[PDB]
Amino acid sequence: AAQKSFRIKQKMAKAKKQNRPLPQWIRLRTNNTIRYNAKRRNWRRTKMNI
Amino acid sequence: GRVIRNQRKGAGSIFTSHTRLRQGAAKLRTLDYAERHGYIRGIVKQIVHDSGRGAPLAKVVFRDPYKYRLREEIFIANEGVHTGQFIYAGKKASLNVGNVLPLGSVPEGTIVSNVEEKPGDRGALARASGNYVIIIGHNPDENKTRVRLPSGAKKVISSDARGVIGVIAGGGRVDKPLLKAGRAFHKYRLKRNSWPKTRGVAMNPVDHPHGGGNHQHIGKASTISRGAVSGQKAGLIAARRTGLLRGSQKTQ
Amino acid sequence: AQRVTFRRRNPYNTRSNKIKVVKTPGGILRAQHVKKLATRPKCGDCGSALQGISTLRPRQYATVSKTHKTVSRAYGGSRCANCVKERIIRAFLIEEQKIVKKVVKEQTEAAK
Amino acid sequence: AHAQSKREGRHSGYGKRKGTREARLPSQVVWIRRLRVLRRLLAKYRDAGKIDKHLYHVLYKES
Amino acid sequence: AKRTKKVGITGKYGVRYGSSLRRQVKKLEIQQHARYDCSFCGKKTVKRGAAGIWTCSCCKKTVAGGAYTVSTAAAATVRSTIRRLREMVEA
Amino acid sequence: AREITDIKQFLELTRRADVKTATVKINKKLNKAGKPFRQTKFKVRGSSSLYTLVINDAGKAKKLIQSLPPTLKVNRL
RNA sequence: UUCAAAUGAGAACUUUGAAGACUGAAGUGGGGAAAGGUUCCACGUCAACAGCAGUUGGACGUGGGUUAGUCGAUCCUAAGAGAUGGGGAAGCUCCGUUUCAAAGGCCUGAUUUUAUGCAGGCCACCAUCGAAAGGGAAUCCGGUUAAGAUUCCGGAACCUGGAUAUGGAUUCUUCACGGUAACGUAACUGAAUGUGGAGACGUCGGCGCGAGCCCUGGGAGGAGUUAUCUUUUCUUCUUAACAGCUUAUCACCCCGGAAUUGGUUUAUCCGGAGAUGGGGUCUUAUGGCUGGAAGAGGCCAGCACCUUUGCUGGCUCCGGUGCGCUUGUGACGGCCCGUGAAAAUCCACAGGAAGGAAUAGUUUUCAUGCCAGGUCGUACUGAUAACCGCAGCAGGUCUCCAAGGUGAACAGCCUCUAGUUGAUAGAAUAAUGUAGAUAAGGGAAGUCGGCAAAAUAGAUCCGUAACUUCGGGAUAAGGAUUGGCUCUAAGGGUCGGACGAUCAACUUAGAACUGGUACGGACAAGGGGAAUCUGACUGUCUAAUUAAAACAUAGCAUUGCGAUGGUCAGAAAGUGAUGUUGACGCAAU
RNA sequence: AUGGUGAACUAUGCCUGAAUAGGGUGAAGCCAGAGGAAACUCUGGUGGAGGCUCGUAGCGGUUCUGACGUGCAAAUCGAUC
Ligand SMILES: [Mg+2]
Ligand SMILES: [Mg+2]
Ligand SMILES: [Mg+2]
Ligand SMILES: [Mg+2]
Ligand SMILES: [Mg+2]
Ligand SMILES: [Mg+2]
Ligand SMILES: [Mg+2]
Ligand SMILES: [Mg+2]
Ligand SMILES: [Mg+2]
Ligand SMILES: [Mg+2]
Ligand SMILES: [Mg+2]
Ligand SMILES: [Mg+2]
Ligand SMILES: [Mg+2]
Ligand SMILES: [Mg+2]
Ligand SMILES: [Mg+2]
Ligand SMILES: [Mg+2]
Ligand SMILES: [Mg+2]
Ligand SMILES: [Mg+2]
Ligand SMILES: [Mg+2]
Ligand SMILES: [Mg+2]
Ligand SMILES: [Mg+2]
Ligand SMILES: [Mg+2]
Ligand SMILES: [Mg+2]
Ligand SMILES: [Mg+2]
Ligand SMILES: [Mg+2]
Ligand SMILES: [Mg+2]
Ligand SMILES: [Mg+2]
Ligand SMILES: [Mg+2]
Ligand SMILES: [Mg+2]
Ligand SMILES: [Mg+2]
Ligand SMILES: [Mg+2]
Ligand SMILES: [Mg+2]
Ligand SMILES: [Mg+2]
Ligand SMILES: [Mg+2]
Ligand SMILES: [Mg+2]
Ligand SMILES: [Mg+2]
Ligand SMILES: [Mg+2]
Ligand SMILES: [Mg+2]
Ligand SMILES: [Mg+2]
Ligand SMILES: [Mg+2]
Ligand SMILES: [Mg+2]
Ligand SMILES: [Mg+2]
Ligand SMILES: [Mg+2]
Ligand SMILES: [Mg+2]
Ligand SMILES: [Mg+2]
Ligand SMILES: [Mg+2]
Ligand SMILES: [Mg+2]
Ligand SMILES: [Mg+2]
Ligand SMILES: [Mg+2]
Ligand SMILES: [Mg+2]
Ligand SMILES: [Mg+2]
Ligand SMILES: [Mg+2]
Ligand SMILES: [Mg+2]
Ligand SMILES: [Mg+2]
Ligand SMILES: [Mg+2]
Ligand SMILES: [Mg+2]
Ligand SMILES: [Mg+2]
Ligand SMILES: [Mg+2]
Ligand SMILES: [Mg+2]
Ligand SMILES: [Mg+2]
Ligand SMILES: [Mg+2]
Ligand SMILES: [Mg+2]
Ligand SMILES: [Mg+2]
Ligand SMILES: [Mg+2]
Ligand SMILES: [Mg+2]
Ligand SMILES: [Mg+2]
Ligand SMILES: [Mg+2]
Ligand SMILES: [Mg+2]
Ligand SMILES: [Zn+2]
């Protein structure tokens, strides 16, 4: 938030890096159930709460 | 019902004294060897105005009997005392306006201010703008002196109790009408959150013993036993009489 | 007809947020924040403006030569000429009258 | 072109005023104008002896 | 050019509060804005600021005293009461 | 940062020590009378102060450029 | 809103061009605080999402991006919060913050077994946390990117801590001279201790002054307009932090001794406690000159030629004006039963412990020089789409900069810079609607009730009742006037001894002429009057059915209380509010 | 009933900060003039007071018992105030 704490910016980074589509080659692994990142986030739909 | 407003003062909180702009506390010097025996001179370095207290203050600074330094004490300016006046304090300090003498060293009829109740408690009686106490007599039978306190009642206190000669400054403040709520607002803006005041009879029952409504009336006598429990003590408390009187004077 | 902006994240017109408008070699208007003014040091026992003493904000007096923080006389900084003239005379006359205080009270000692 | 006509004294009749006379030109302004002119004239005439310091005073209170 | 007839400094309050309050205010408002003689100093230069503190513009001297006047009539008579007692303790 | 005017001192500067650089600028200015003259500015990078010297007279100017220690890297025009 | 081109399978909706318009500097402009957290930027891109569409996006995929000794945090203390010796509590823990406490650490000599144990010694009711708006060490300009910049580049600086050497000053009269003084200075030893100062302080008003802005004259460029008129309209013509000299209202000093009292502010204050006058000293806020600095930046021109790029030349100047606007600030003045923070930090004086020279030492508050300056934040939105309201919601959420005309004006209306032209769209104009208008004659006969609507409205001049707490009522009421144009008269500055020279403002009154008798021509903008009930007044409340006559208030009266106290708090306490209090007080009605 | 969590909304005090076009009125204080035998009284200025006034922004929410009333909105929109 403009001038921010490290701790939050810290969490902000982790929050950016979690935020990407499921690696497609995981859908090729053996006995794989996964189809997509069902934990995806987006700043205009679900907030982080700090 | 509900905790009434006057009980709710005791938890301080909202109702503590607004003391940011105060000087220090006003007190007399600590009763030491000098004042116990002879006297000690000082200069009133300035006279100043304490917030939330009509009656000015005297910052009069003495030397230190026991060390190289100056020690500023905060006195309540006693009307006529000025900047640069010398202020002598002790048993042997002469009867001039401003000095602080024990109550044994002053002749009957002397009038004084800021008097201690026990010697060394640095001030206690007559300190509000314009007030004063009057020695009426003495008594060697225990170092005691009998005085007239502003309230009129007489109190017999140690002759070693100090006072400062004269009447508190701050003149006749209450002689002038407040005129308007605004002026009262600022008055208490600097004291304590006690204004305005809501009449209890305009309350609902649950806030006040008077608050029982439907016609605004107190319902039962407004004069309450001393032995009543907090929650019931609202109104004319252990009142030993009520109504208009024209009482002229007090206890002589 | 050109407008301007603060140069620091503080957005509120306080005392530490005083602003100057300046034209620059660019030929463009620009703001600049100015550190609040100083006040002249004041006479110890009469609160007058000390003459000859320079007027800087407190820690700026640590960056400065010593002829800047005084005059050459007793109580260079501190007090203000007449305040020390009065000072001297009062001392004299008192110490004088001290003597007299004593020789005279010594005199009526022998009277008894 | 209009500002020109304005100081040819042209566009300021009684139906071109929306401010009170005080609003457009304040009276206290006028006075200070009028007063300082007199103060200054009385000053000059003294540092020149067209009038004596005694008359000056009288005229100074009189202005 | 007489301006008022009765109100004076208290035209300020206009019509509000009512005659007597306005009346009594006026009396003390006049006391506290007055310029008083200086004891030490001679000059008519003691002005008030804050109830009780009274200080001389010219010689920077400050006196304690009345809330709305320099010197209380009560303080005045006590002045005398005190001196009177004093002159006795040294006679 | 500072302007210098003593012609004695300026030379005392051109060596000094910390002085390892200087520059020479030529301004086509005009005099009060309005005649195209050739003011030349002599600037010396100190260590925390730019002493520059102003000489209007081209004479004592194009003399002085050949009055510097030659061990001084000088920027020209 | 429209036309056309471009791109695309595909175009009302994307891009570029043109037109038409809006926001109108109280902005649909330019930045920030909270909050978000990548939304910023480039490329690719359209299944879902943007309640029509989509090639567009704040979407989807992939990558890129936030650079500091000087901007903040960080240090300080504020309301407050809260460890500790303790005291309560079965206990979770409650109380207390200098508090019933054995509560330390600074200098430096001794010692030259040693940088070190000790020998001198003063000083200390003393945790800490608590401000990205309070206090506070120091950075400016130009340039740069797809996105960062008071952070990068280039140049110019300053501070803080640490080092220190050369120069200079000082001295045989050891710790500087000069000036009557205010005081001047490139310096000119100063431990303990004490003291003074800065930090550091309300609000309103008029007046003085600066800065930027506004307007404007000549010229040197570029642009527009030219049937005809205009020596024309638009625009360019800049100067940072820092350094040197210089510069001020206030104030202070010397000479001098005043009634015929003078000086004097817009504002009536000052003078034998020394005015007026003559002559000096200070503060440097702020302006001027120069350095910084034209090499920068701005505006033009002539060549060059696939690109990257250029290249070479010019010009960038000299004024004026003020109840102007915004802001800064000075000396005054009004106001209070209101008199309008603290601490860190920096300086100084008093003091004189000490240390110091003559063949030599003293001093790094004087100039110069060397070295170092960490950590975290830094993108962007900041709102009719980046926050909160389930959302791209007509709601809500702190702040700064603010151009021309009309005009009293930060109003309304129109414009410039900048920014938008985005809110599904096409065809018709039944009823009934929502919003905007108008009606012959009558004029509240409508209705619970003039509800709704209408009428009044600026300004100048005249005029103005009962009553009244004498202040008001009162813009009471009631009237006349108001455009355009051409004139007349009055109102100022400066320079030379009752004139004369020169400059620069609009404003006020008056007169003539004129028109479909209009003229505050849009905009803007009180209807009035006679009474009853009622609350004195300004103020307050039922967020979302009640704004009142209710609550408040000043005023008045009553009650309690002298501290071993009154009222109140707590389970308890060596507990707490009033209390930094003391009857002109606090508490209760 | 027991044990817990909320003063991001709102009520109140405290601390530290920020904000509010343009006009009407013309209170103290001060200057001058006129009448008067005197005492005084009148006139003209100046100055700029007020929980003063017209009125934006601000804060508010009177009336239309307007619009909306499966809304823009679980309190909004318009005019009036
Ligand atoms: Mg921030
Ligand atoms: Mg209960
Ligand atoms: Mg309170
Ligand atoms: Mg307290
Ligand atoms: Mg204090
Ligand atoms: Mg209250
Ligand atoms: Mg009440
Ligand atoms: Mg009720
Ligand atoms: Mg009962
Ligand atoms: Mg009950
Ligand atoms: Mg009743
Ligand atoms: Mg910024
Ligand atoms: Mg700050
Ligand atoms: Mg000096
Ligand atoms: Mg100086
Ligand atoms: Mg006015
Ligand atoms: Mg006036
Ligand atoms: Mg469209
Ligand atoms: Mg428009
Ligand atoms: Mg506007
Ligand atoms: Mg794209
Ligand atoms: Mg769709
Ligand atoms: Mg689609
Ligand atoms: Mg990256
Ligand atoms: Mg800083
Ligand atoms: Mg605790
Ligand atoms: Mg802290
Ligand atoms: Mg830049
Ligand atoms: Mg201080
Ligand atoms: Mg402060
Ligand atoms: Mg022209
Ligand atoms: Mg600077
Ligand atoms: Mg002289
Ligand atoms: Mg300067
Ligand atoms: Mg002016
Ligand atoms: Mg100082
Ligand atoms: Mg930024
Ligand atoms: Mg931004
Ligand atoms: Mg947006
Ligand atoms: Mg949201
Ligand atoms: Mg949510
Ligand atoms: Mg919204
Ligand atoms: Mg503005
Ligand atoms: Mg419009
Ligand atoms: Mg925008
Ligand atoms: Mg829609
Ligand atoms: Mg009709
Ligand atoms: Mg009719
Ligand atoms: Mg009917
Ligand atoms: Mg009916
Ligand atoms: Mg009827
Ligand atoms: Mg109506
Ligand atoms: Mg009509
Ligand atoms: Mg006419
Ligand atoms: Mg009422
Ligand atoms: Mg009002
Ligand atoms: Mg309601
Ligand atoms: Mg109401
Ligand atoms: Mg006023
Ligand atoms: Mg009125
Ligand atoms: Mg009003
Ligand atoms: Mg208006
Ligand atoms: Mg309100
Ligand atoms: Mg509103
Ligand atoms: Mg309502
Ligand atoms: Mg309705
Ligand atoms: Mg419907
Ligand atoms: Mg209407
Ligand atoms: Zn005096």
Swiss-Prot record, chain B:
Cellular localisation: Cytoplasm
PROSITE patterns: RIBOSOMAL_L2
A Gene Ontology term for the protein's cellular component: cytosol
Biological process per Gene Ontology, one example term: ribosomal large subunit biogenesis
Entry annotated with the keyword Ion transport: no
Function noted in UniProt: Component of the ribosome, a large ribonucleoprotein complex responsible for the synthesis of proteins in the cell. The small ribosomal subunit (SSU) binds messenger RNAs (mRNAs) and translates the encoded message by selecting cognate aminoacyl-transfer RNA (tRNA) molecules. The large subunit (LSU) contains the ribosomal catalytic site termed the peptidyl transferase center (PTC), which catalyzes the formation of peptide bonds, thereby polymerizing the amino acids delivered by tRNAs into a polypeptide chain.
Protein name per UniProt: Large ribosomal subunit protein uL2A
Swiss-Prot record, chain C:
Biological processes annotated in GO: cytoplasmic translation; ribosome biogenesis
Localization terms from the record: Cytoplasm
GO molecular function, one term: structural constituent of ribosome
Signal peptide: none
Main location: cytoplasm
One CC-aspect GO term: cytosol
One Pfam family, short name: Ribosomal_L34e
Keywords linked to the UniProt accession: Cytoplasm, Ribonucleoprotein, Ribosomal protein
InterPro entries assigned: Ribosomal_eL34 (IPR008195), Ribosomal_eL34_C_sf (IPR038562), Ribosomal_eL34_CS (IPR018065)
Subunit organization: Component of the large ribosomal subunit (LSU). Mature yeast ribosomes consist of a small (40S) and a large (60S) subunit. The 40S small subunit contains 1 molecule of ribosomal RNA (18S rRNA) and 33 different proteins (encoded by 57 genes). The large 60S subunit contains 3 rRNA molecules (25S, 5.8S and 5S rRNA) and 46 different proteins (encoded by 81 genes).
Function: Component of the ribosome, a large ribonucleoprotein complex responsible for the synthesis of proteins in the cell. The small ribosomal subunit (SSU) binds messenger RNAs (mRNAs) and translates the encoded message by selecting cognate aminoacyl-transfer RNA (tRNA) molecules. The large subunit (LSU) contains the ribosomal catalytic site termed the peptidyl transferase center (PTC), which catalyzes the formation of peptide bonds, thereby polymerizing the amino acids delivered by tRNAs into a polypeptide chain.
Family designation: Belongs to the eukaryotic ribosomal protein eL34 family.
UniProt xrefs under PANTHER family: 60S RIBOSOMAL PROTEIN L34 (PTHR10759)
Curated annotation (Swiss-Prot), chain D:
Location relative to the cell: Cytoplasm
Sites of Phosphoserine modification: S27
Superkingdom of the source species: Eukaryota
Residue ranges of the region described as Disordered: 1-21
Subunit structure, as described in the record: Component of the large ribosomal subunit (LSU). Mature yeast ribosomes consist of a small (40S) and a large (60S) subunit. The 40S small subunit contains 1 molecule of ribosomal RNA (18S rRNA) and 33 different proteins (encoded by 57 genes). The large 60S subunit contains 3 rRNA molecules (25S, 5.8S and 5S rRNA) and 46 different proteins (encoded by 81 genes). eL19 lies in close proximity to the binding site for eukaryotic initiation factor eIF4G.
Function text: Component of the ribosome, a large ribonucleoprotein complex responsible for the synthesis of proteins in the cell. The small ribosomal subunit (SSU) binds messenger RNAs (mRNAs) and translates the encoded message by selecting cognate aminoacyl-transfer RNA (tRNA) molecules. The large subunit (LSU) contains the ribosomal catalytic site termed the peptidyl transferase center (PTC), which catalyzes the formation of peptide bonds, thereby polymerizing the amino acids delivered by tRNAs into a polypeptide chain.
Additional detail: Present with 97700 molecules/cell in log phase SD medium. There are 2 genes for eL19 in yeast.
Family according to the record: Belongs to the eukaryotic ribosomal protein eL19 family.
Protein name: Large ribosomal subunit protein eL19A
Phylogenetic classification of the source organism: Eukaryota, Fungi, Dikarya, Ascomycota, Saccharomycotina
Range of the intact protein held here: 65 to 127 of 189
UniProtKB/Swiss-Prot annotation, chain F:
Localization terms from the record: Cytoplasm
Keywords: Cytoplasm, Ribonucleoprotein, Ribosomal protein
Gene3D superfamilies, alphabetized: 3.30.720.90
Annotated Gene Ontology cellular component terms: cytoplasm; cytosol; cytosolic large ribosomal subunit
A Pfam short name: Ribosomal_L38e
Any one GO molecular function term: structural constituent of ribosome
GO biological process, one term: cytoplasmic translation
Keyword Heme carried by entry: no
Family under the similarity heading: Belongs to the eukaryotic ribosomal protein eL38 family.
Function field: Component of the ribosome, a large ribonucleoprotein complex responsible for the synthesis of proteins in the cell. The small ribosomal subunit (SSU) binds messenger RNAs (mRNAs) and translates the encoded message by selecting cognate aminoacyl-transfer RNA (tRNA) molecules. The large subunit (LSU) contains the ribosomal catalytic site termed the peptidyl transferase center (PTC), which catalyzes the formation of peptide bonds, thereby polymerizing the amino acids delivered by tRNAs into a polypeptide chain.
Subunit structure of this chain's protein: Component of the large ribosomal subunit (LSU). Mature yeast ribosomes consist of a small (40S) and a large (60S) subunit. The 40S small subunit contains 1 molecule of ribosomal RNA (18S rRNA) and 33 different proteins (encoded by 57 genes). The large 60S subunit contains 3 rRNA molecules (25S, 5.8S and 5S rRNA) and 46 different proteins (encoded by 81 genes).
PANTHER family for the chain: 60S RIBOSOMAL PROTEIN L38, LARGE RIBOSOMAL SUBUNIT PROTEIN EL38
Misc note: Present with 50200 molecules/cell in log phase SD medium.
